[PDB]
Amino acid sequence: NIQAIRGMNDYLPGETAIWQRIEGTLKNVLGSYGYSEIRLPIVEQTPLFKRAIGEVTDVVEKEMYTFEDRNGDSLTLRPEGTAGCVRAGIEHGLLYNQEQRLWYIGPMFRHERPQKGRYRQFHQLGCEVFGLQGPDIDAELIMLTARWWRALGISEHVTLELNSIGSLEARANYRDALVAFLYLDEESREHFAGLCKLLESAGIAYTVNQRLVRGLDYYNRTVFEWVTNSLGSQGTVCAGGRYDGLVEQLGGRATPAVGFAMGLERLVLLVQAVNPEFKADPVVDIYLVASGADTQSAAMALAERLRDELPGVKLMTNHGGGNFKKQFARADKWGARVAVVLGESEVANGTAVVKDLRSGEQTAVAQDSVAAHLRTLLG
Amino acid sequence: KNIQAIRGMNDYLPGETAIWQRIEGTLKNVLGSYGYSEIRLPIVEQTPLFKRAIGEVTDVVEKEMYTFEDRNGDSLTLRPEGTAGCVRAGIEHGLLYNQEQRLWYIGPMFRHERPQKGRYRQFHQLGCEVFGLQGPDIDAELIMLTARWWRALGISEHVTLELNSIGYLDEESREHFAGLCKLLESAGIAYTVNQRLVRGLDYYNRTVFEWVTNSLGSQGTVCAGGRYDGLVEQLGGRATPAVGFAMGLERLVLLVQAVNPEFKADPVVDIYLVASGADTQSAAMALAERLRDELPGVKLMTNHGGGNFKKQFARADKWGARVAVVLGESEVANGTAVVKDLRSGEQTAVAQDSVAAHLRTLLG
Ligand SMILES: Nc1ncnc2c1ncn2[C@@H]1O[C@H](COP(=O)(O)OP(=O)(O)OP(=O)(O)O)[C@@H](O)[C@H]1O
Ligand SMILES: Nc1ncnc2c1ncn2[C@@H]1O[C@H](COP(=O)(O)OP(=O)(O)OP(=O)(O)O)[C@@H](O)[C@H]1O
Ligand SMILES: N[C@H](CO)Cc1c[nH]c[nH+]1
Ligand SMILES: N[C@H](CO)Cc1c[nH]c[nH+]1
């Protein structure tokens, strides 16, 4: 028997439910803003990450899952999404003289030490917006993430650390001031202050971490991250910053850009920790108990009808025999509230017993009306 | 220089995503109506798994896998399918032993195939598998489910159900096939037994079926699956029966878009927040935030980075904004917000506490 590549986990039925609830909420919020999904390929040519991310980068150096295609091309399971993004953005000319506010969701691959925060295959929801210079757009991005916390009820457990790393020149003529010892540009100071203001007015509490630089070479002015001193993830749930030059660098015309990516596992962990009781929907609403002389063909028939009469309900047609007791229990296992029982009698009588699994009260109903009775019984 | 996308590995721009998501949800939703639960699996697996499960003699294992050697010399492979990975995690977490599990999963698969019609290197599959059920009943349920999917997409009148048993069939397999062939007849599902229908994998056993479309929505095939009772044992766990199918989303999306060019999705924006003048923006985002709580479910985009009214008005059009909540200095000092209906052009000055109501009325 084979196992799962250490650091690359599975999300089982029960865990899945919660992940989908949190995801929807997140997507929904992105919709409330005008943001559109963008779907990018899991692997890209290795030179991309090299060029985009940076050579000296610890990511490039020892975290990438590179390899070779049957044609000698150096391929790489993506470590992030911005690069793949800017790449297709230029590839299909969506960024030239255009505004685009998008988000993507999917896996990323990094070769790191499996931990609580870290995984070898992790999931990111991240969003980028191209075309907007001023701080105003940066502020909207923060506000977006702010809304997210508010919606998950973990607003009380994330802090905004914020910082500006100026431009190339400032970072260029900074080697002296740092390494010798071993200083910002005006337009970047103003742009940062203007953002610091928009937040202040917005009523969003930030903290300027003078020593906050991110792990990628494409960032430029704004740099920020959302951290939980609740150790939901590794500490940082969401992080991101500006990167005006990357579009040009990757071969397209210059346009401004800004974004952030968030660790879904950290998020999901935080939510489940700070909101101890946050269960999402049950897996099965009604479980169709059915037995006797040729029931089944009829039982699935009743079931299909009940699904059209009751859209939105989760109904599971029992299967492969099982005495009443067996099925009732299977019903419970799934967390069915009601059970539409169905013996031969009920079949000949054009009926279907409806048993309320909560109180046990079972009353015979006519098929055409069972839908109505369940609709009330459930809500 | 510019990097391009790995041939056979394509992106889905904003435009096409809207439609992809509408289609996905319907499918998802339908899976939910039946009791099926999702299971999320890893993109890469240990190569032996695909060898062992899929088959050594399989054209798949031979020249199609995206295998590579991890830093630790371990042979890794980018999944060509999900079943193996599924059964795998199934055994791994002890979900299959003496249990019934009805699940589905959705994500990318990879195969090194020389670039064709409905054949990519990275493609997407929605598939589902249920473990624990012997009888033809369960198989029947699975066909019924796919049938409902076509019905909901409006492509029912464009998929044919090819069916076959692959054990010259032994007693048990014959009775099992017949019993299903009937469940179908009774259910009113029209099938065609293709006596020459064998799948490409080595784990299948009796039922072997596929949904085919003549306009070439899929690579002819949209959906395909069959049984595989022994694979749980083969891969190292106690024997239990199993059945499933996987569907090619690019094919399906292609088909739905062909069989009904009508189908599109909600536009990008509902309300586009026009705004300009002496210090507006800080205030403008303030209103916008408010309107979002008052109007949940509505897609509202706050214009950014200058632009004269005309400019902002056209951008609102680009998005397909129905209304525009304009907001100059006056509106600000007056506690108001001009509500313009981009359809008629009729703009009325409304009080902010009331804008929500007007918009709600204006949209639906
Ligand atoms: N291996 C991983 N497992 C889980 N989450 C991760 C992993 N790598 C990155 N993330 C998450 O993705 C976000 C965006 O990636 P980013 O490049 O900012 O990470 P980072 O700078 O390496 O930070 P960290 O040290 O927390 O991994 C991170 O803030 C974190 O929440
Ligand atoms: N490379 C691909 N690109 C797009 N869709 C694919 C690709 N490979 C498979 N599919 C889709 O996935 C379904 C299930 O694939 P499965 O692994 O059962 O068989 P297959 O070997 O892909 O057969 P087929 O040649 O008919 O696609 C197919 O019927 C098809 O719709
Ligand atoms: N992809 C980055 C980290 O993984 C986060 C981000 C996106 N755009 C700008 N910053
Ligand atoms: N495993 C193939 C693609 O993932 C098709 C399938 C699923 N279940 C049974 N057959």
From Swiss-Prot, chain A:
GO CC entries: cytosol
Compartment(s) where it occurs, according to its Swiss-Prot or TrEMBL record: Cytoplasm
Enzyme category, top tier: ligase
UniProt entry keywords in alphabetical sequence: Aminoacyl-tRNA synthetase, ATP-binding, Cytoplasm, Ligase, Nucleotide-binding, Protein biosynthesis
Catalytic activities: tRNA(His) + L-histidine + ATP = L-histidyl-tRNA(His) + AMP + diphosphate + H(+)
Pfam families: HGTP_anticodon, tRNA-synt_His
EC number: 6.1.1.21
A single MF term (Gene Ontology): ATP binding
Biological process per Gene Ontology, one example term: histidyl-tRNA aminoacylation
InterPro entries from the UniProt entry: aa-tRNA-synth_II, aa-tRNA-synth_II/BPL/LPL, Anticodon-bd, Anticodon-bd_dom_sf, His-tRNA-ligase, HisRS-like_core, HisRS/HisZ, HisRS_anticodon
Family classification: Belongs to the class-II aminoacyl-tRNA synthetase family.
Subunit structure: Homodimer.
Protein name: Histidine--tRNA ligase
Organism: Escherichia coli (strain K12)
Gene expressing this chain: hisS
